Amino acid sequence: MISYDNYVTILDEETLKAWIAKLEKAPVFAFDTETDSLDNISANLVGLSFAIEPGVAAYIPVAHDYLDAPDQISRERALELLKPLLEDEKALKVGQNLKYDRGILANYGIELRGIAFDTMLESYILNSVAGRHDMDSLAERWLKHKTITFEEIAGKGKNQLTFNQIALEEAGRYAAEDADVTLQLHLKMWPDLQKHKGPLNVFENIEMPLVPVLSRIERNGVKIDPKVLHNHSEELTLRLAELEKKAHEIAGEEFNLSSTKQLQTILFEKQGIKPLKKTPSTSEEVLEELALDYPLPKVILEYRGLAKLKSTYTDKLPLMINPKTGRVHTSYHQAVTATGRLSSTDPNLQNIPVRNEEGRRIRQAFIAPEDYVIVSADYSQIELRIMAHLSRDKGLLTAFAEGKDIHRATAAEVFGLPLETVTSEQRRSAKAINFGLIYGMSAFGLARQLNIPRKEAQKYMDLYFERYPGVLEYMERTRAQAKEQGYVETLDGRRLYLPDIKSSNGARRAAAERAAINAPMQGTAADIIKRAMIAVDAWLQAEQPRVRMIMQVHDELVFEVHKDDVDAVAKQIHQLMENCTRLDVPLLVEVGSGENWDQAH
Ligand SMILES: [Mn+2]
Ligand SMILES: [Zn+2]
């Protein structure tokens, strides 16, 4: 257990100033903040904690207000005395998920600098799939120590206490242990992160500098029109009713639009072929095949989709508007994906349909404030360009070199015919192949996405590998080093460990081979996107133009730019993105503007 003897609870200026003095000469120090809410923009700082050495840490309570709470240094006094240390780029800080802490200090006009080590990221860069990268998991993995959980001091359920209600000493045990343990994790991981210049590089120049930019992006938020969202909601209830009637009208009686229950008893009972279609799914969708001539399945198809979309974005989004800012603040996760791409939640921007008409309507609800315009900067098929370089293929490289459409160029060579005469079905085949390679798709999986028979798909892949030889070389060379060293790397050094590469199990090992081919191209794009964010954010902080970086989804960065500035700013973002990142991959940035995200997209 941790008692009230481990750490000190600072309740007077004389002691705080003493610690501040020690802090100023420590090589590095761990620091943490305690608040009354998980909501960064509207949380209140309840206290701060530090650790200058393993086992030597303190907690400074500034805003606990339960009945009869003892005197504490005022939040304002503590922050003014602590400010210089925090705003000093030279004083290096350590912390677990420093993003959250940086934002909290920003609620008080304090710019946290010297953001050098985030143990959450150290862990992530060491091995992304090693396990969960949260402090509690880390401490158990690297220190065989079980930390005090939040539920332990605050409680569970609706009657859970906010930090400001917890007794000073109990708050101290939790807060000071955080800092202390954080420092210990650093000391154990930092040394390891240097055994290789690859991960080291990614961690230092990509991941760490990104911590404050993600904070600024998250806090800026995104302006959403709730009216638009409400109309769309009402309209979708009418379309759901209409679609249900049409289904009943096609056959007879009433029924749910649920497969393997009410659908099979209708669809195949009135001709077709027995099996159902899982909502496994992106490989054999029985329902959309019948949709080319059959009407009923086509309506049930479009019904489910609308039903999912409505309750996921149409009814949720408006409830996520923050009362303090009036904007929506999405949560980006830096240490979650195995390849290094940022993920997103509440809302998960990446699941909003792109090639679909309704997803477009959702995007229209993302609006620019008065006198501003939404500006969308996107990397045109970056992954494919990355594969081009990785395979050293003159064909692909030349296609991008002279600005031709790679999918048509691919079909022109694979099917052997002029580029101006390649048909829509041929381009669609090549595209299926091109993206099939990135995910390491099997010759039969391609047959299921193209609807052609097996070995007909094989015919195509053999023609591809012959016309584009370098792509097979890469596929094999990557599957090679993967088994040899148990991992694959990206252009910047980022690593994905594949433990099941020699699995001895069939499919488990196949997954590991697909990931081998994929990870290098996907992780490299991720790295590129992060370098663009840092680059654009640096210019933002230095030049102070009238623009905010509001979103990051897939291979694009979304901004809010002042209408009078649109042109000069567009020139700038474009240059920053296709020039201040890597100079070895042939990159292209498509920049567009509009009144809402859909208009600029
Ligand atoms: Mn914390
Ligand atoms: Zn804490």
Side-chain angles (χ1 to χ4, degrees), residues 1-275 280 285-601:
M1 198 83 279
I2 278 191
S3 58
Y4 308 128
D5 309 348
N6 299 59
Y7 315 108
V8 67
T9 295
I10 302 164
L11 261 22
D12 73 89
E13 287 185 28
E14 209 204 274
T15 303
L16 205 210
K17 291 193 280 201
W19 270 78
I20 290 187
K22 283 194 284 187
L23 257 8
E24 284 166 345
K25 51 196 169 202
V28 305
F29 61 96
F31 131 92
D32 189 25
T33 69
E34 302 301 318
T35 65
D36 64 9
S37 165
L38 282 165
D39 187 66
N40 202 89
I41 203 68
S42 62
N44 289 294
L45 177 63
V46 178
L48 306 97
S49 69
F50 297 87
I52 39 191
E53 196 183 317
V56 185
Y59 180 55
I60 309 146
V62 304
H64 287 249
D65 43 29
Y66 52 91
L67 201 242
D68 291 323
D71 290 310
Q72 297 154 64
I73 301 175
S74 68
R75 176 159 54 213
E76 290 293 288
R77 182 64 179 141
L79 288 188
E80 85 173 310
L81 288 176
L82 241 14
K83 173 162 188 160
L85 173 67
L86 278 18
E87 290 191 331
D88 180 16
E89 52 164 301
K90 302 306 171 193
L92 313 185
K93 295 88 177 176
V94 191
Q96 170 75 9
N97 192 25
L98 248 23
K99 189 188 59 173
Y100 178 87
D101 303 271
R102 182 256 162 213
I104 303 306
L105 290 165
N107 283 341
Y108 304 88
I110 295 177
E111 259 284 44
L112 203 244
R113 306 198 182 97
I115 310 173
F117 307 94
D118 190 319
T119 60
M120 180 190 75
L121 292 180
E122 291 181 340
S123 180
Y124 184 65
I125 299 297
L126 239 32
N127 180 348
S128 64
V129 305
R132 293 203 55 208
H133 305 112
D134 62 275
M135 204 184 80
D136 301 61
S137 301
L138 295 181
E140 194 163 29
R141 203 182 301 142
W142 301 80
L143 313 178
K144 279 59 181 60
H145 174 242
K146 297 186 189 185
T147 62
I148 298 172
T149 214
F150 192 77
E151 290 58 45
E152 279 172 45
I153 50 156
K156 290 180 189 176
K158 280 184 64 182
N159 279 327
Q160 189 192 59
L161 297 176
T162 49
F163 218 77
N164 60 104
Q165 317 194 89
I166 304 175
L168 266 39
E169 298 297 295
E170 284 291 332
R173 306 173 57 240
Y174 179 91
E177 170 188 60
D178 280 357
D180 183 18
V181 170
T182 296
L183 188 51
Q184 296 182 35
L185 288 168
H186 169 60
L187 272 14
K188 288 211 160 206
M189 288 182 295
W190 180 226
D192 288 25
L193 252 171
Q194 304 191 73
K195 297 177 183 297
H196 298 109
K197 302 312 169 198
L200 190 274
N201 165 60
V202 175
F203 170 93
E204 288 217 300
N205 311 100
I206 295 177
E207 297 298 331
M208 283 310 302
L210 192 67
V211 169
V213 352
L214 273 200
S215 171
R216 276 182 293 261
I217 280 183
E218 293 197 349
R219 288 165 61 80
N220 281 154
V222 84
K223 229 287 190 60
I224 275 179
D225 193 329
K227 294 206 307 90
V228 173
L229 254 10
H230 205 55
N231 295 350
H232 194 174
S233 194
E234 304 283 41
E235 183 193 314
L236 285 182
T237 314
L238 290 164
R239 290 169 63 175
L240 286 169
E242 271 280 4
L243 282 163
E244 198 196 341
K245 280 175 172 176
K246 288 189 168 186
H248 299 162
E249 180 181 356
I250 280 177
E253 66 189 304
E254 273 67 275
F255 66 125
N256 283 289
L257 292 295
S258 61
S259 69
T260 37
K261 254 318 303 138
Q262 301 283 271
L263 300 186
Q264 50 181 6
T265 51
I266 298 295
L267 298 166
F268 321 111
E269 167 249 70
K270 67 171 187 180
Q271 186 170 70
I273 331 183
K274 41 212 149 167
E285 246 313 295
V286 178
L287 304 174
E288 73 176 87
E289 256 99 294
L290 300 154
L292 286 302
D293 23 80
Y294 282 85
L296 180 62
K298 172 183 155 82
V299 309
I300 303 160
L301 205 70
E302 213 230 15
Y303 182 82
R304 293 185 187 153
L306 292 185
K308 172 192 78 82
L309 196 93
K310 179 177 179 281
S311 90
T312 305
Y313 294 107
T314 304
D315 301 348
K316 290 288 189 308
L317 254 38
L319 280 44
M320 317 186 116
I321 297 175
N322 198 317
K324 197 170 188 181
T325 59
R327 301 170 61 105
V328 172
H329 305 271
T330 168
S331 311
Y332 290 95
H333 304 285
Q334 202 169 359
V336 165
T337 66
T339 48
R341 276 191 176 273
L342 298 178
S343 68
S344 191
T345 56
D346 306 279
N348 180 351
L349 268 34
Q350 307 206 286
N351 292 345
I352 296 165
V354 182
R355 276 187 163 175
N356 177 341
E357 193 176 302
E358 297 304 304
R360 287 188 57 172
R361 292 191 57 186
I362 301 295
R363 297 199 232 96
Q364 290 174 14
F366 289 65
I367 62 179
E370 192 64 43
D371 286 325
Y372 283 66
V373 298
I374 294 302
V375 173
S376 175
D378 169 72
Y379 281 115
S380 302
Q381 63 230 154
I382 186 178
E383 304 210 336
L384 227 33
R385 297 178 172 257
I386 289 169
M387 176 181 96
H389 170 90
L390 284 191
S391 66
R392 298 118 194 236
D393 199 274
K394 172 160 165 274
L396 304 174
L397 265 49
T398 310
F400 293 119
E402 50 203 16
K404 302 188 304 188
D405 186 287
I406 27 70
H407 298 120
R408 297 188 81 224
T410 296
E413 292 250 61
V414 171
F415 297 96
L417 59 153
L419 185 90
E420 321 94 79
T421 77
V422 41
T423 79
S424 291
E425 180 218 57
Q426 297 177 323
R427 183 199 133 111
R428 181 152 49 239
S429 283
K431 181 171 185 155
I433 295 175
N434 280 336
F435 288 150
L437 298 166
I438 292 173
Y439 295 67
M441 272 295 106
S442 53
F444 315 113
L446 174 259
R448 303 194 89 190
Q449 317 301 284
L450 213 47
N451 276 335
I452 56 183
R454 316 138 171 215
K455 284 61 182 299
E456 149 71 321
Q458 179 67 42
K459 188 182 188 298
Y460 294 174
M461 292 183 125
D462 302 347
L463 270 143
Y464 188 99
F465 291 140
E466 184 194 330
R467 202 94 294 100
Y468 298 112
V471 180
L472 221 206
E473 286 186 36
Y474 161 85
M475 294 189 107
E476 301 183 89
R477 160 179 53 162
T478 284
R479 300 220 307 290
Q481 84 141 266
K483 281 171 170 60
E484 151 84 318
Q485 61 208 35
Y487 73 87
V488 284
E489 346 163 53
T490 75
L491 262 47
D492 276 285
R494 174 174 235 121
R495 298 182 189 188
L496 168 57
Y497 284 87
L498 306 158
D500 288 344
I501 189 103
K502 288 152 286 193
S503 184
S504 91
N505 180 331
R508 214 193 244 147
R509 207 176 81 197
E513 286 175 63
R514 261 186 276 123
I517 293 167
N518 176 250
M521 296 177 278
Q522 183 151 39
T524 303
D527 292 338
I528 294 165
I529 297 168
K530 297 188 174 183
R531 302 177 70 153
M533 285 170 92
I534 294 162
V536 183
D537 182 86
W539 162 62
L540 249 40
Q541 300 299 281
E543 247 201 64
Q544 235 63 240
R546 288 181 297 182
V547 7
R548 286 207 263 225
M549 200 183 294
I550 60 172
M551 290 183 279
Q552 194 293 125
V553 53
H554 293 130
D555 305 318
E556 87 183 289
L557 294 184
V558 192
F559 310 77
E560 266 183 11
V561 184
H562 192 279
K563 75 189 188 75
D564 294 341
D565 302 337
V566 191
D567 291 337
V569 177
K571 266 198 60 182
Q572 193 55 197
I573 306 290
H574 184 85
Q575 283 198 354
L576 288 176
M577 290 173 77
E578 74 181 22
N579 305 299
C580 303
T581 312
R582 294 195 63 92
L583 304 172
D584 55 331
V585 177
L587 301 176
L588 172 66
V589 179
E590 225 71 76
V591 180
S593 52
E595 283 307 334
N596 57 82
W597 185 16
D598 183 64
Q599 238 179 90
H601 193 85

